[PDB]
């Protein structure tokens with residue numbers, strides 16, 4: 221996975237670094253969130269863009285994965301947007317490039 225195929229994925233896909241800063245953000249995720257990729261890239265996913273994820277079930281799982289070198293998690297979650305609660309399944313894992321990590325979002 222590491223362009224037009226990337227924005228056409230059936231699942232949402234976000235690439236972050238070890239401190240949480242967004243490097244890649246696809247269109248499928250933009251469609252599920254309402255966020256434009258250009259103002260979101262360069263900002264921190266956990267502290268700025270998606271604060272609802274700043275709990276031990278999500279950001280804690282991310283922090284532990286980075287600190288142990290291997291990020292590998294699969295869990296159910298619910299995104300608390302302005303309109304209504306959107307139930308999703310999250311898949312977190314490492315990338316082919318060092319210091320880079322992936323967050324996959326489905327449904």
Ligand SMILES: *C(=O)/C=C/c1ccc(O)cc1
Pocket residue numbers: 249250253255269270271272273299300
């Ligand atoms: C909670 O604050 C979730 C926010 C959110 C999740 C995923 C995105 O792509 C954008 C915002």
